[PDB]
Symmetry: C2
Subunit: 570 residues, 2 copies
Amino acid sequence: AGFKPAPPAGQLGAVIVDPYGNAPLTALVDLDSHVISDVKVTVHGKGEKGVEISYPVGQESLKTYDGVPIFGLYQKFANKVTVEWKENGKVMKDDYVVHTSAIVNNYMDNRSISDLQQTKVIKVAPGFEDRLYLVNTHTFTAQGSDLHWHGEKDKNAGILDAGPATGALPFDIAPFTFIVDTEGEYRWWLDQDTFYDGRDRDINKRGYLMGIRETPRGTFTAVQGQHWYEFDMMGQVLEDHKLPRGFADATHESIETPNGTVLLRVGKSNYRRDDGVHVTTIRDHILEVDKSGRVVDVWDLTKILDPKRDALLGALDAGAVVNVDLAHAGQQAKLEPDTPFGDALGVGPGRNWAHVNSIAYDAKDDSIILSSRHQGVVKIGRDKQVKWILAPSKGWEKPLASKLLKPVDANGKPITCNENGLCENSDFDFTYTQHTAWISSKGTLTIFDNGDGRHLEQPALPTMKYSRFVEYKIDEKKGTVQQVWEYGKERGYDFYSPITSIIEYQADRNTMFGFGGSIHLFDVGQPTVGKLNEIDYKTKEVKVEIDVLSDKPNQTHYRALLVRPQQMFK
Amino acid sequence: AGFKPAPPAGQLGAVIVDPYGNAPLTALVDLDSHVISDVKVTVHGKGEKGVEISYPVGQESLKTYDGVPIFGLYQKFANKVTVEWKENGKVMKDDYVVHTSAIVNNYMDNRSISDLQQTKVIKVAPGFEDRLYLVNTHTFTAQGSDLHWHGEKDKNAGILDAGPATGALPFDIAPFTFIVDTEGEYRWWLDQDTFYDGRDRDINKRGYLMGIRETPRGTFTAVQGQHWYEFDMMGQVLEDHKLPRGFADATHESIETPNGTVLLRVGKSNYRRDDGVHVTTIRDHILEVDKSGRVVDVWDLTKILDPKRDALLGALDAGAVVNVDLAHAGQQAKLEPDTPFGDALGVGPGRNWAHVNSIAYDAKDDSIILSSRHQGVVKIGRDKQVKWILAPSKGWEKPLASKLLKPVDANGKPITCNENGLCENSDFDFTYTQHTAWISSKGTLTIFDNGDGRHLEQPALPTMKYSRFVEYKIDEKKGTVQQVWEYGKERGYDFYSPITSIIEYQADRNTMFGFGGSIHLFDVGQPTVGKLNEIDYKTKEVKVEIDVLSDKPNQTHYRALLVRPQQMFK
């Protein structure tokens, strides 16, 4: 006679590159029936300033992989890797040379600047050299959007006409998923064919790979089209679920709860409107599902919030929304009453009236906090009741108006803001077209305030626009909110992300982690900038600033995560 | 233009037959955006003595399916179905006529008696008319076993020779999976293509569909080849996991624990023997895995029990082992020291020394109880230590001998049994080549004692063989075992199942449920009998006896389950 397996490389088994076939900068040391413990892996830096990557490896992982996972390799390089373990109460060590192959971008055309996205390291403080960031970005396919859901023909349409579309099937794009270190080197890559195939027409492998979040096991969830997933840093796909049959179009977020369920943002297909027309709703439903794919609960936001409120909808940059473009960049969006159902700015179920793009679970009262790009930030209870809302007061009717939070200063004294969220004699401002409204380890609400439609108008000039990191403290009993921190207001257009983006508070080194996904988006002909940032919470000093430039002009990035090797292999 | 969806049948949505495409005797009432509760489904009996099936439907199910599930249809029939619910505090009712298509057996050849397995109702006591049994049986493919794992060439083999086989890849057969009512009618069918494709050579869809067990959600797990699954009675495949890479050949059992894990019975691939030869082990490892497919724990039985112990191995009918001779039927198995590694009777890792075929989790001390066909019944701890053994004393060395349970009568007085398990002046006997060693709702240990190799010999004539249901009571602290119940001893060869089979205690009606999967297996040219039974625990009266006859001669059944519609749709 046959062909023998790879023989052993040292004192354990063979060292296999990319055992699952989805993560070419990983490897695996076959255990070959050895019984070991106390395992530590080190991957050595490339050259003089190269970052070394180091992590322990738990028993579950050794058993799961039947070997020792090797994460952190450089591409096309003779990686030097050390593995240490205990075996029969004796200390053991092996040094391996692990050659790798290349990273491939399978989606290139005349818009391509080059195959990979470029990195520019701007600033790395001391004691931050070891940081790693997983960048969740994407790259245009040659074809663009080729598929639509079919809907119901509306009453007042041509006798002869073909059926309309519905939903958001065209929200579809090739992934570009990697990890970057502080020398700007790629240290991990998730093969684009792991989940996506843009040449075939198998909707099972289509969509927009989004909402990558860690789990209590140090693995990650994600969504893409009409499926959701779980995977690990060796590239093993651990779960793959079709959405339940009533739902479609999962985007933006996926988060595991502590109860072993997962929260997803979807649309409802075959939603019967009060006028009896069926549509696939846009980005306005939430699912709690178990690890079986079954639905544990569903929040239908069309009956909980207000699909008629156009206060923020009418104030937006038509050029944005990810989507994008562009002849109409800068221009304020003029709503129309005859806007056909679809992924379009508008009111009512079957249009993009809410565009919820983040989810967080509050364990303390079994509730969920949501970021609605076009309405504000809300908490809704298990009981399907609104608990509070963080938004400008304009447009809200009762009973919902009554749940708006009242702003207050450090001593708890009301702050005067008009119905557009413009406050006087304060740093306090609300969020507009925001993202990632999550719960910090401190118990506060952190948000990335993108800043389109700030104060419910377009400004006089496009460049008078800014984005903020911002943190709030909320008293639920009293119904008040206090801005306790902010950043970015002063950096102007060069730090403005009209779309996407994220922040998350890091307690380990007291920093605020940021990723601005859409900087310079509207600079026609230029790469879009994804700017990784760690800001000192105390001093506001920049500790890390790294820029990722898109491989094609005018191509937004979605999010990034700060990942930690220590937690990857439990 | 287009084609419209099926219109509404009555007051909800359309009634879709086989929505998921794997269970043709099911249907679904689309919810069409209606908000309902208190759902109850009734499927009417066919004709005069036809059994009616009725169940409630919980909210999770309505949301999961976006509709009301309909279970219990007859094939090729105008099924009459009633659905009742509450909507806007009003009571509601719809009567539907649901036409079905046929059941198909896709695996037929000259051996075939007819396409379906025949049922013969023998006895149905009053108050047992409503019982349903899920039959886990199988049907031969034209090709038989066509595939082997490749192994390592052993030292003392021909220079020119090809590599050997290893493992148990040939354990491969088409499934045949249905639910039968007490009129002997098929009321549910699982499409054979759900998991199996015996004409293609994709090993992902090969194996022996086994170990079907219910879960806390009213769904079922199962194994087949190199994957494990979860499915529900609407035929939705909820989970599908590849085995972890170190393991192969999952058969016999899959059971969800209360900790959200699942227990599986596998072999280990690339197992390094002490002589340095690599093999795939046979049926001698246990995995706890999570819903992510990851390994939580592993029990390697080659280091826990005694792979050298041939006390029972040498006493077996060569005609059995599932697998089936049958030219050497009746004959005693003569072990050889040069038996090449494989699915073969023999000692040591790489042969079938243990043939473990059932697993149970003891939540009281976080341990597992195992049925080893070829060694006996053992409890092993989380700590990988043997806690006790229920078997004849011959062949066991220390430290294991010391864990053997000592038999006792109702007053706790020792019972005298020789090393072969023959007892004097008692009804007490051990189990031989047994199956399903499970924990009843009473806290006792129930077992199907097939009875091949009884008293560690073949009898003088082949028909001097019998099978028992049997229940034991164990004092772990004292190290003793008491037989407290038995049945079938008196029924002789006609109730003898040399292989497979199952029992389980039903507390709802104080019965012992049983399935004899291999009756008349050795009758050349005759269908094999799978006999479903419910025996009154108190009186020993037969309450249900129903016979399933195989669609080809000499083709064993594996198991059946008593299923309860009340629990299927939580």
